[PDB]
Structures are given as C-alpha cells and as structure tokens.
Symmetry: D2
Subunit: 333 residues, 4 copies
C-alpha cells in the first residue's frame, strides 16, 4: 500500500527503502532537500517538499510515518499534520518520543479526527536489511489499517526459529512487531527495552573488567592471597568463546566480540559514556511503581560517574576522610 515519511535520517530512510523493497508506495520529506533528493533516486522515492504537497501526493485515508528528533521538533510536526491531514488518516511517530508526550499528541490530533499510532523502533543500522523490532500502541482499528507497514519493516518470523510452544499460525509478535496496548504503550515498552540494553551491556563490561584485572597479584589496600590473582586472560578470545554453547549468548556479546577483535585493549576508546535518557525514564517509571530495579538503575548510574557527575560527592568523601582521619588524597597515576 501507500505511505508517507516525514524525516529521512539514518532510520527514516532505511524504512522507506525496506518498504519500497517490500512493495509499498513511499512519499517523503526532510527539511534538507539534499536528503530529499537522495531518495528521489530510489524505487518509489517519490520525493516531495511540502506538508501540503505530501498530503497531496498521498490519497486518503492515508498513513504518514514521522521520525524526526524527539522534543520540540516532533510535536512541531504533529502540530502541522493536524492541519495538513484529513480525518480518518493515521500518524505514526517512530521517533524516540517520551510516552507521556504521545498522550498530548493523541489529544490534539483526535480533535482533527486523526489517529496517532506510537511506534517504538529499535534495530540500528542493520534494520534496513535485517528489519526493525516495532512496539506499537494506539487505537485498535488504526493499527489493523497500518499493520501492513509494520509487518514489512519488522524482520519477520524467518529471522529466528519459532519459540517452542508457539502453535500453528504466526502471531505478530513472532514477526517482530506488536500492538502493545493503547496510546503511548509502544514507546513505553521500547523505553524499558533500552533500559534492559544498559543493564546487559554493563554486565558484559563489568565482567570484562574483572577478567582484565585478574593479574592484580603480579603488580592503598593490601591484597590478601595475591597468589590467587595471577592471570592474564585473552579478552577477545573469551568473548568469542562465549558466543556458542554458553548461557550469555546475545547480539551484544557478538558486537563485543567484534570490537575486542579489532581492538584487544580498547585503547583508543573513550572512557566517557553517554545515556539516551530513555534509560532515565525507565528508572523513573520503576521508582514510581515501587519496582526495585537496582541492576538497571546502577548500570545507568555507572554512566553518570563515567562523565564525572559524581564529582562533588567525591570531594565530600575526601573532605570527610580528611577531617576525621588526616587521610590524604593520593596523586594521579
């Protein structure tokens, strides 16, 4: 069927290509018209430069997909589409929008008789060929109507064997997309998906670091039994070995195996790690719900400390440690 895409970033673009390859008619716009002409070249690029233009070259009922930066710019666009589109149309925001914002947007465009489908999109660069895991919330009927687009841009059941106990017909979840519930529920689930992302990468990273320093007995606190810690491990080969037959098999380990093999010491990488903030929201939801989430919240708190956001607290320790114990801050290595 026929679809419009506002925003052609590394992700906006790879969905219109994966869709054009899947047999759908795509229309598109990004403010920068060197990126709007980039696609014009491809199958069903159908480039365009107007919101009105767009609403024009698409026939209602129509479905438009939005992937522009979260925050003001997104809402800005929904604002317009409140005009530019007719009633009974459909709005898919696949941006990294906060689920509480999806509730205002659903409000606004309901007045104009548009439906908002909120699509939590994950996958990265691989998704144009692999496909994206989509987590969608919104009105039940408008999901039915746009379901062909999700089914095409999800990886599809072929991507992984069926789970044992899965019976007969293929359910959408097995395809890689899911109506997670009403409005906002798609971004909500994707939010928690990124929180789990953090927890898994920290578990890999901390482990790697334990292995890395198992030689501490070769080389202040006295170390009892330094005869015990005398190992120099091959971190690239342990990472690779764990990829088959173990319990921690995962994409992230696969990725870590690659990275360790290019750089065995990760020497050129920054010790400064950022967070998306979706990880922030996942931690705040957990607090709001009384759900203890130390593993995910500490993984996120380890990123903050990696940006020296623990600065003042550290000085307070050294300040306390000085006044009770004359304790000295040791010089930098």
């Amino acid at each position: 069927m026929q679809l419009g895409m506002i925003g052609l970033g590394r992700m906006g673009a790879n969905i219109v290509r994966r869709l054009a390859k899947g047999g759908h008619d795509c229309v598109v716009y990004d403010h920068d018209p060197d990126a709007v002409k980039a696609m014009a070249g491809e199958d069903r690029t159908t480039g365009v430069a107007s919101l009105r233009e767009l609403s024009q070259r698409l026939s209602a009922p129509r479905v438009v997909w939005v992937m522009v930066p979260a925050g003001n710019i997104t809402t800005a666009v929904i604002e317009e589409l409140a005009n530019t589109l007719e009633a009974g149309d459909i709005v898919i925001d696949g941006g990294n929008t906060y689920y509480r914002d999806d509730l205002r947007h659903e409000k606004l465009l309901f007045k104009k008789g548009i439906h908002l489908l909120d699509c939590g999109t994950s996958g990265g660069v691989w998704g144009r060929e692999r496909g994206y895991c989509l987590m969608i919330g919104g009105d039940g009927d408008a999901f039915a109507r746009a379901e062909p687009i999700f089914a095409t841009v999800a990886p599809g059941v072929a991507a992984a064997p069926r789970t044992p106990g899965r019976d007969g017909e293929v359910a959408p979840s097995e395809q890689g997309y899911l109506h997670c519930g009403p409005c906002g529920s798609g971004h909500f689930v994707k939010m928690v998906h990124n929180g789990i992302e953090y927890g898994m990468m920290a578990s890999l990273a901390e482990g790697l670091n334990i292995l890395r320093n198992a030689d501490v007995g070769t080389r202040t606190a006295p170390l009892p039994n330094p005869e015990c810690y005398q190992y120099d491990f091959d971190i690239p080969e342990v990472a690779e070995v764990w990829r088959r037959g173990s319990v921690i098999g995962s994409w992230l380990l696969d990725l870590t195996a690659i990275a360790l093999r290019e750089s065995p010491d990760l020497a050129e990488f920054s010790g400064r790690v950022s967070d998306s903030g979706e990880g922030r929201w996942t931690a705040i939801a957990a607090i709001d719900e009384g759900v203890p989430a130390p593993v995910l919240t500490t993984a996120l708190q380890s990123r903050f400390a990696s940006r020296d956001l623990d600065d003042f607290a550290n000085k307070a320790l050294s300040a306390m440690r000085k006044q009770f114990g004359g304790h000295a801050e040791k010089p930098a290595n």
Copy 2:
C-alpha cells in the same frame, strides 16, 4: 577415543552421550549404581563400581572427567584418584570447582605424575545436542592431549556465523572451547561467565517487572496516575524482542518459552538460589578494585529473595518506631 566419567548427573551423563555419538569411549561411574545402573549399556558405555576398577580399566596416559557436586565431594574424589591413575594421566575437572581449590587439587596431584585440567563447563541441560561452551586451564601439552575431547563436547563453529574479520581457519575460541591459561583459569573465566549471566538475567527480570506494574494507576503516593494505565501482555513483549532488537539473547529466548507455558510464571516461588560462582565473581571484583555494581546488585537481589535481608529490615523497622 576414550575417557572416564565420574558423576552422572544431568550434566555428566549428557556430555557422555554427546561424547559417545562422537566416537569416544566412556567408563561411567557414579557413587550410585542406580545412576550408573541408569545407563544401560548406552553406546560406548560401561559401568564400574571401582575407582580402581576404573583406573586400570584403560590405557596410559590415564586421564578422565569428574562431574561431582562441588565442595569436599570433589576433593574427596580428587584424593582417591591420587591413589590410582599411575602417572602422566590428566584429570579433567568439568565441575563447578572454585578455582582457588583447583590450585590445591593440581599440586596435590603434582606429587605424582598426574596432570590437571580444570574445565569450566557451560550450556546447562541443552548441551547434549546444542553443545557445551568450555573454558579450560592447566598445561598446554596436557590440554593438547585431551583436545580431541574438548572439540567434541563443544558446539563447533557451525553453531553461529563467524565473527566479522575472522578469516582463514577456525580457532578453538570459534568452536566453543578455549584454553584460558594455567590451572584455575578455566574455572575462573566460567565463574565470571556466571557473574555476567546473573546480570543479564536480572536486567531482563527487572524490565519485565517494570512492565508488569505499569498498570499501577488503575489499582508512596502516586502522582500522574494517568501515566500508569497499561496492561502489557508480557508473553508477547518477550517474543517481539527476539527479532530486530538490541536485547536479543538466548536468555530472552528461554524467557519467551516460559511465559508461553505460564503467562504469570505462577509456578515459581521467587525464592532464587545461587550456586557460588556469582559470589566468587563479586569477591574477585572487590579484591581487584573493579567496581561491579550491576553484577553484584544482581547477586544481592537473589539474597533478598531468600529473605536474607530480614534482620536488617527488622533494624529499619525498629529505628522508625523510635522517631
């Protein structure tokens, strides 16, 4: 070829049967016949009730596998082999041995001609068919001798596409087994493997829990009850995350299976054991000055699920009564 196998549990037995279909000769023995007895002439399988019957049964170099419950049972076996095994024969300890105990086991054997390869065995109860990831330490020539076994138990490179940039011939690492270094290093890596495993499990456990309670507004005051109105179908989220997402993993796959069998996991108590490798990994982290909150917090969650925080909760309760 040939080898011995002391212990025939869920693991020891199943590696024997994957060892056998691989063309190896096994000599099964478990302190219980009902177990040994349990294996009724499984291809390439013969049962003895003698460590002695066991040793002399096969050719030098005399070497074999022990899969007995970790602790003094492992040690208590590892003294008997002292009294047997001749010399030049290497003991393969595939059990969940604390690597520090590996050091005492190896020297005790050094007072003889016996070699010791400590093998951290992974893969659980999927391993008969899937294969077991293995991390072994001890001597490189002793490892070289037993290498044909390690390749057969392991999953083989075919179990996963090769790493981008892996060119030429398959390395040990690629086939699912790896010689990690001197004695103890095998069980040391796998100890850390279980540490990482606790933190992956907990990462997705906590996440599902956040989702499961997103319907909080419908049922410590909560502002914005209108922001917590969702009744998520956890079995479906778990299987959507299998394809096209960052967090794919074998653990997610197994979590998906279990939610399909039981959408509320009602059968499970929530009282979670820990076998020790997670704790040893946390101690190693602490002695190395490596901060590991994410892994250690996951261990501590398992303690709490067993009500081991109870005395502290009592102290908290008793403090607030005062003010």
Copy 3:
C-alpha cells in the same frame, strides 16, 4: 505575633503549642471540631468553624500555616484560602507536599496576591519539646515577614554546639531553620533530607546484619569456603553501644539503634516489611534528571521495595530462566 493554623494532627497541634508557649497567638481550625476543641483550653489559642471566620480573626496581613495530609487535601485547603485571604497575606505549607505541587500553589495564590511559603518540617514528635528543623522556600520578604514563627518552631542554636569556623551573631541556619530559596526550595531540601536518612538507616542495618551472621560457619546453596573464618557470635547491642562514642559513625540514628537493640536484642517482634514515604522516591527521581549517580541512596530505597515483596515477578522470571537453562529447582 499572630498566626493561623489549619488542621490539628499531632504535627499541626504541636507546632501550635510550641508557638503559643513561645509567645505567639494561635487561631486553630480543623475538619474535626473535636480536634479544634482540644485546642480551646490551651493558653493563647482559639478555635474556628470556617475559613471565613478564621481570617475574620487575623489582622491582615495574616499568616496561615497549613499542616494537612499531602496531596488532594492540601490543594483543596489552599484553593479556598485563595478566597478567604486578601492580597499580601501569606500561606505557610508545612505539610509533606511535593515541591512540584508547590509550583501550582504559588501561581494559584499570586493570582490573588497571596505569597506561598513552602516549609519542609522534620524531626517528628520530639519537635514539640526540642524543635523542628525547618527548611523554607518562597519569597524573601514574605519569609522575613513570617520569620518570627519559623524562628520559634526551630530548636535553636542551643540545641547543638556551634560549628568551628563560625563566630558572631548567629546566622539563621544555626537556629535550625533556613531560607533555602524560591518557592519549593524548602520541600526540595527536605525531601533530600529523607533520602539521606534512608541511606544512613540502610548502612547501619546492613552493617548489623553482617555482624548477625558472622556465625555462618557454625551452622551448615553455595559452599562457604573458609568456614572457620565465620565463627563469631557477636553481642550486637553492645557493639552498637560501643560505637556511640569514639567512632566515626556516631549519629542520632545509631543512638536510637542502641536503644532499640537494648530493649530487644534480636528485634524479634519487629516487622520485616519497611514502607517508604515518597520523598525518598522524589530524591531518587531528582538525582536521575540531574544526572547525579546515587546508587547508595537509591539502592537503600529499592531495598525497601524488596522487603514488601515488590521484587516478586522479577524473582519468578529469574527462577523461570534458571529452570529453562539449568533445570534448577527452587528450594
């Protein structure tokens, strides 16, 4: 000076009595005329039957202290205090209100020209005799205008020896009260006060549990290597006592800790389920927006959750994975 106090729970009733004995004239209102009546006999105090009559008896400009259940009850009192009060009068919110909620109350009262003093009140029951540590956000003149009352409710610098490094005419902070900043500052600092309180509680508690089970080698799942290293039966109440002078971990909480362990050495009668206020939750939310790592504070909050079994589905999911990949049973 003259003051209004709305509601009379133990907190609200005691601020009233700490004030009227400090030489302040108190006019009290409550939902419950029973509660209003208990304040009729008290020196310098007077009851009311409606907010209209409350302000009839306070000479504008008036200062009204609200001490009521946080949330929807607080908002309602304030909303009609917009009608009962004229321009330039001030409303002190001493209740346990969310600082973000103070933002909508300030705007809703300025529309009618009422200043909103937000006041975070700590210390509990001993405050009636020892004073409440006070933290006040809002307008600086309104604060200066109502400062005689904050001063009187506070403990007073007698309560603690002065700080080495301070000398002179006593600053407001050494009174036990302080002007934190614009509206919401007082509840903001007071919510972090509780977060720290949870942090210290927890540290003691974990500490004592570590002592409690040093005898773990005697009694005998993970093999405990080196069992001989854990063969101690510790006198926990004496250990807490000894720490009370000469250590670094001296604190009012350790003092209460020592008391509690003296009455009951095994805390046998006490609950293992620990509830949480909500400010501790506000604190942890604040830390995450700010990008401030607070594992200690937050992990103390999260321990509270797990003690009310709120960790349960997570636990079931761990066990479900364990049976899938290992055939592990639950004991």
Copy 4:
C-alpha cells in the same frame, strides 16, 4: 607496656596513655622518628626491639600500630622470639582479622598472647578518645583493660543510653572485648563499612542539591527544566540539618566544617582511596549471604572515583560504536 611504631595513631595513643597515667616504652624502625621522647612524658624510648623486650617487667604487654601487611607479620614473628611467655601483644593495626589467627597461633606456640584491637577515631582521638574493639583471651584482656579505658573516650563523651540503668559497662566506656581471636578486627571492619555508607549517603544528597539547577545550566533532553532551577547554599543546608532533624551525626558536623572553610571543596581532587576494610566487609557480606548493596555500592563509588571503571567504560563505548 610499650608501643611499636609511632604514626599519627600509634603516637597520640601514648600521648593520651601517659597523660592518663601509665608508663609506656617507645620503639620504631625509624629512629628519625622519636620526635618523642621529649620526656617522653612518662615515656622513654629504646633503640631496638631487643632492648624493649628485656624491659618493663615480665608481665609482657606490647602494642603494635605499624601499617598492616607483611610489615606487621614480621614484627609478630620477631616479637615471638623476643617476648617471653605470659606476655601478650596488642595489635591495633588495620589487620585483616584472618591475619590475626596465624599470629595468635604463632604466639601461643611460645606462650605469648595476642589481642586484636580495632582502633578508631583518628586525628581527633587524642582529646576525644579512640573507640576500641578487642578480640582475644578473657584474662589477657582483663589484665590489659587498664590500658583500654584510658585509651577510650570515657562514658562522659555522650549521654548514657536511655534505658541503661545501673552501673557503667565497658561499651559505654568506648571499648569492648568483642569475643575470641580476630573478632576485634572484624567489628572495626564492619564499622568502616557502615562509615563508607553513611558518608556516601550524605555525599550523594549534597551532590543532588549541588545540581538542582540543571534547568538553568542548559545526556538526555531534560523535561521540566522549571522544576530544576535552584541554587542552594550547601554550607548552610549542611548546618541547618545539625539541629532538629534525623541525619544528625558527627560526619555531618565535619561536613559542615569543611564547607564553612571551603564552600566548593576545591582543595580535594575526587580520588578516594580505600584502606581495605571496606572491601573485607563487603566480602564478608557475600560469604554470609547478607545483601549489602548500600555498603557495597558506596565502596564501588570509591573504586570508580579512582578511574577503575575504565575498561568497562571503554567497553560500553566500543559496543555503542557497533550500532
């Protein structure tokens, strides 16, 4: 009794001991030390371990506070040959409570006793007294208890515990025989654990406040920047908490001092060392199955402050690039 080594701790003990009234004979590896003995008041030095050993009677009691590690152990093995039987050695160093068990065995071989001592209070100990936790023999302790009460702060240091009626017990004094060998050091270890957690708590809260103005200074895109526009007088917030609230504590008063001297705490870099007893507290929790996230994460915050998270961060950065 004498004192071996004279650091900030070992010396201000014997300055407090003598003013108290007993006589101590002083020693050290470095004679360049010995700023004492001016008198030393009630104090006279020595130039050899040997010289001191044949000194001050045969009721031998000597107190060691030299840095822990192997420098300790050498002293005790030397002090074994140089003390005669019946004399017991007090160890007030930060010794792993397990180190004491070989030493106390080492010493009763030749009839010398040991008493573990957990010595706290630091640069305030002289005028404020040093809280001591002592492990060992019940009679050896009793003979030395004169030393401990003049070393400790004295019951006067704080009001008696409400509900403690009757006569003074040693704990109110500031000292206590915690139990057998190693127990004295075990308690000071946990004290140090709790301390890390108590100041991390305050430290974290102060950091929270310090950054309550992130809505002005403008990583995630912050929602509700209006909710975070506060500049707090951190040295006054510190002060006001000292009266009338729950977090009253000595660590706060010292934090209120430092902030009055240094409003932004510039003279401290952020690099926080850890003497080791925090680590053993955490390891004891993990051996006992006691969950101690608050204390174990306070210590991990120190680790990260020394950049020991480094490789894990490089790891997370290398993973993100792969997306």
